[PDB]
Swiss-Prot record:
This is Sodium-dependent noradrenaline transporter. Changing residue 235 to A: Loss of norepinephrine binding. Mediates sodium- and chloride-dependent transport of norepinephrine (also known as noradrenaline), the primary signaling neurotransmitter in the autonomic sympathetic nervous system. Is responsible for norepinephrine re-uptake and clearance from the synaptic cleft, thus playing a crucial role in norepinephrine inactivation and homeostasis. Can also mediate sodium- and chloride-dependent transport of dopamine. It comes from Homo sapiens (Human). Keywords: Cell membrane, Cell projection, Disease variant, Disulfide bond, Glycoprotein, Lipoprotein, Membrane, Metal-binding, Neurotransmitter transport, Palmitate, Sodium, Symport, Synapse, Synaptosome, Transmembrane, Transmembrane helix, Transport. (R)-noradrenaline 1 binds at residues 10, 80, 84, 235. It is a multi-pass membrane protein. Changing residue 88 to A: Abolishes norepinephrine uptake. Residues 52-70, 178-180, 251-256, 347-361, 411-440, 488-535 are cytoplasmic.
Amino acid sequence: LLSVVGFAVDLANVWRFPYLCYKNGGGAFLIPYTLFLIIAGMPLFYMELALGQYNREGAATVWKICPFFKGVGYAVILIALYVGFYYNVIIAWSLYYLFSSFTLNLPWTDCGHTWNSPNCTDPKLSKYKFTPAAEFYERGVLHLHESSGIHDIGLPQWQLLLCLMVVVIVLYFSLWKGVKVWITATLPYFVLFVLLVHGVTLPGASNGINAYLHIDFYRLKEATVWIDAATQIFFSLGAGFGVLIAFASYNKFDNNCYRDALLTSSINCITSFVSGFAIFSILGYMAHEHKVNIEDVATEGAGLVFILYPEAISTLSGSTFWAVVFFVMLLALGLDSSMGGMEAVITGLADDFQVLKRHRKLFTFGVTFSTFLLALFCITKGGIYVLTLLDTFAAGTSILFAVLMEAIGVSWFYGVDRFSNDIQQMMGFRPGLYWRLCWKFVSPAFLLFVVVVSIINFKPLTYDDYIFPPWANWVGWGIALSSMVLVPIYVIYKFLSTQGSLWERLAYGITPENEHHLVAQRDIRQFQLQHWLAI
Ligand SMILES: *[C@@H]1O[C@H](CO)[C@@H](O)[C@H](O)[C@H]1NC(C)=O
Ligand SMILES: N=C(N)NCc1cccc(I)c1
């Protein structure tokens, strides 16, 4: 019953939300987060679920309702493929930490090991990169010290190569035949609650809680926090990768997508809040232990959780049991999230091409073995730089633009009243005025604003104290545009491939393929003002 908390929690909420929150202060990130969850996240979540469940198609072939928008399905499939590259490397880190967490002297506790620089500092006898946990993550896991930047990235690390190989083999044998246990669905919440309890009882964590609950508004005057919050909203819920549409493809018709959207968004909100709470309790405790400030006590990159959660584990009694339990939780959660993403990709491209649906094993090998070879850039010596580049640009302005185009193609060109009648046929009740106003007007306007301020207010990409070269930002914007350009390219392809006059081309591009016999009789809904004045 209610296998929804095992979809409402994913590696985003527990790995990416921590550093996005910490990077943007305390609750100054939580105000835009819940705002976008109320006006944009939940409406588009419910819209994607209803679309997939009604049309019975994946992310690419759901756009037979307005053919000019299939480029958006291609774009979200490419977003998912881009995210998988650096997303399986986080699972490789999880597996390496789980393998290293089977000793009784955890390697992130003392710093008399071999991966330690002569500049270590121990609070048991600061610059937040000379601590045993940070020096284990950077030099004992990543081997980042052997890399001068993103230009000088070495060869893929051997042991991380083994971990990534295991991860990719597991993903293949999970996805090679199946169309897709509850303990791996409730263990995230158990671990998060244990961590919350210990964090609130930690010494020095009151300061972290005060810093987390403190809402500074000069940070809200700027635009970085809003773009971060929007991107995290569409990264956590999954709207923008084709995962919700591909998973609703297999739902029953009478399934209540409304209550699933409501409950998933609510669990996501409370889970992210409790996750930030635990994270900042650990951060306050770390600032107390290392005798520094909370603002410069840890990294603001993707490896923040691999320094925070080991540091909290190192305090609990029986630290090895909790290390093993936490990293099994993280590994299983990441594996489920990656199964979801790769199954979104495979379902989209297999409902699009029937030869890809017939050869499920070969196509799964092609999708998995390609994200393995391209994840070899993120497991190099300077692969944290490639992972930062991808995390910044693979799902950035791209996913916002993609969900904006989904909302537009469903609300304005397909019809929001047509979509509402579809939903009323599926479940039995019209969505409601709040939902239609968010689908048609509110969510598209906010998404357009965020995309525009994301393109016009763009900060150059940096790691902790390392500035990426300009060509790195050019490469990142090329990665972001490789998906945002699929929509106009498909519009121009579908326009230059439809026989007929200009108006017949427009009609055939905006009319669902199920009703392409109407254009012959010149009966097009979108060509009347009544269609666009439907609220
Ligand atoms: C350690 O600190 C010294 C400062 O005297 C510096 O010269 C050296 O490069 C540092 N080694 C590292 C960061 O590995
Ligand atoms: N659960 C969310 N929101 N994302 C998970 C995800 C997305 C794209 C690709 C992969 I691999 C995994």
